[PDB]
Design a binder for this molecule. Structure first.
Ligand SMILES: O=C(N/N=C/c1cc(Br)c(O)c(Br)c1O)c1cccnc1
Ligand SMILES: O=C(N/N=C/c1cc(Br)c(O)c(Br)c1O)c1cccnc1
Ligand SMILES: [Cl-]
Ligand SMILES: [Cl-]
Ligand SMILES: [Cl-]
Ligand SMILES: [Cl-]
Ligand SMILES: [Cl-]
Ligand SMILES: [Cl-]
Lengths: 151, 147, 152, 151, 152, 152
């Protein structure tokens, strides 16, 4: 499939609250690209300390959201929607580079992730793209992932 | 429009009970349109329900009441952070609420409330909660503002 | 078939969990008819951080939620008796809420007692009505219709 | 007064969520004894891990709620209900002795703290008593605290 | 039986979970005799939100709780070694606490070290005593008796 | 003027609070040059409930965040010294992040030590780089360019 919801996401990613930062997958093309998003609301614990009186979604959390989206792309590209194989694999990031923050993300924003496969070889996948809010580029980054066997 | 920081200056509700993220339309003594983003990154989803995230219906109603409260605060004293800060809001009655579609993470929960009747601190509103243009809930409620 | 259940029994029947399991103990239960339960209210609850600062007030919507869960427990055990194995894959949806009226603010230190009576039930759809009480007085009235469903 | 509610407790004790363990004061005789309580509900964070499937209010937290009542007694005995002076004081607990746990406390219980002044000399206060659920003693302990100036 | 266990091993032995599992690593362990472990203290802990605002202090009573869990880890590995299957069926029960002294306040940035020795033990009943240390100084002392039991 | 600071001081300088204040103590500080600081890692942190169940690992992006806050403290104190009053009218933001590499997983029990060096500064624009260490071993490295902005 090309569109996935939280329930499908929960079966692929090992991340859970309060570290699962992807709510829905709206577009996915194997070995090419993924478009996913996370809704930003004031009702998140993170906003108690970032910052009091001034809610701003952490930039590092935006990058984390892009990573999870990218790992979802890499994983589903190879094995598709397979919850089983998913429990036997782990996708952790080795590097991150070219990260730029252009606009602050706040409650009410739909943080949309746009990642594409720059290149991949074996279990090493390199993705890149931007985070967008209402069509505008809020952030950008490149990440290298390593897919390994859990345990 | 009114963003989260403005809402914070009028409504007394704080985390984890501030369920309105933005005000898109406001017409004193008439209606108000606002919304709250729904994300998995919310603590309530740990218990409602595990392995099956569904935004609580009562919280949908709470969001509508808060939206109505904002309409009440501003229709009464305009945008006045000073008066606001001494008040709190109390739910008085809730009636005729119907839930049609479950709200889950990824949804933009939009509130549409019109004033049905008001007097002093006591306000009665009614409207709907919508997701992508569809009515996911309807409700009527009466709230009271106080010191 | 029992009439008194504790938190351990409530956990095996209701799907709700922290921070949305708002029933602490069942004090009386008559199958297909009524139930009496309660939830203790303490400052040591996260909802109080924002409702409101310096003025802790148990939300009215959460009182109604606590009443619905009471009805849910009643609905399930009246249906399959006390069977956690059947219960563990069931969820509960709110369908409607009517005639709610709040009379007295519930605060930390209150023992919120739920009194629910079955008004009408058909299969998975149960319509209960009753009150929430603190120290023998009505703090809230409510009528609600919920549906029990298998996790699909 | 003799009955202080959560709002009065908030103005005297510095403790806040999730460490304010006294919900209401029912009895208070200056320089002698205090009776208060904290409700025990499942809707508390500590139950997430103490213990999963077996909700049991931690024994050490019963003692804390007992110490907190003592602190309230001591403070009110010295200056009465004075929130302004309250902000300038510290009740540092020095010791805890002879603690016995007889019955487990669980969601649905009304934990009643019963403390009395065993000895008061200068800035040092020694209180002792029991914790009770429905008339039955579930715990007992002795505590010594020092009154001082915050900073 | 190892002598140094990490969080992953502790999770498999003790029944405690967040936010009540107050032992991060086991450094030294000698069956039926003594144990050395520690819990890292960081500002990023919910408990500091209220104890107290603008001046984080790790609650003395939690320092004692931490000492108990270390003793509980000793007690169990002593009677059953590293055995998660049997451990999963139990909980630790506090029976008594004595001679606890709080000498030095514990703050974020501190590595809270637990030092306990078996004063007495019979079956599931264990009596340990010792100190809590930060950078070699004693910040707290205590004696306690716990009991391991079936979650029946 | 000082090279050592504890959470009390860190709170007066950084606007970050729970659950995003990720620096517990500063052990070495040198105006316009470098800073050495750390954050203790403990299982008792909310982040571990979801990252990941049964396998607690401190998020790599949070390590970077910790390095950034450290750098930010460095930048500010380098320009105004320990001045709480002015600190509360300013805020350091991340403009860019580069050359980030994760070498070793960070887990409960670890002392995450931040090592930041000032690569270039000119006014409110600061560029730092360095590593995060555990037991003297590099667990991560990164470069950041920040901006000391007006909070209002
Ligand atoms: O119960 C009390 N405990 N206070 C202890 C306490 C200990 C530390 Br050392 C501290 O930093 C702060 Br502030 C306290 O309030 C209390 C403190 C002041 C006035 N009335 C009651
Ligand atoms: O292994 C890493 N990430 N996550 C690992 C991981 C996650 C889950 Br869940 C799991 O079951 C296993 Br075994 C893992 O290794 C990693 C690798 C290098 C640096 N930091 C983190
Ligand atoms: Cl940021
Ligand atoms: Cl619902
Ligand atoms: Cl209310
Ligand atoms: Cl205990
Ligand atoms: Cl303490
Ligand atoms: Cl990571």
């Amino acid at each position: 499939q090309s569109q996935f919801f939280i329930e499908h996401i929960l079966q692929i990613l090992p991340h859970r609250y309060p570290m699962l930062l992807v709510d829905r997958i709206t577009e996915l093309q194997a070995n090419q690209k993924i478009v996913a998003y996370k809704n930003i609301t004031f009702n998140e614990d993170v906003f108690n300390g970032h910052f009091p009186n001034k809610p701003i979604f952490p930039g590092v959390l935006i990058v984390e959201g892009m990573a999870q989206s990218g790992g979802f792309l890499a994983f589903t590209s190879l094995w598709g929607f397979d919850p089983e194989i998913a429990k036997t694999k782990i996708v952790y990031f080795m590097t991150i580079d070219k990260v730029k923050f252009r606009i602050p993300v706040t409650p009410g924003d739909r943080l949309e992730y746009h990642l594409e496969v720059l290149k991949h070889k074996g279990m090493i996948w390199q993705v890149g793209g931007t985070a967008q809010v209402d069509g505008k580029v809020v952030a950008e980054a490149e990440l290298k992932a390593m897919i390994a066997e859990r345990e």
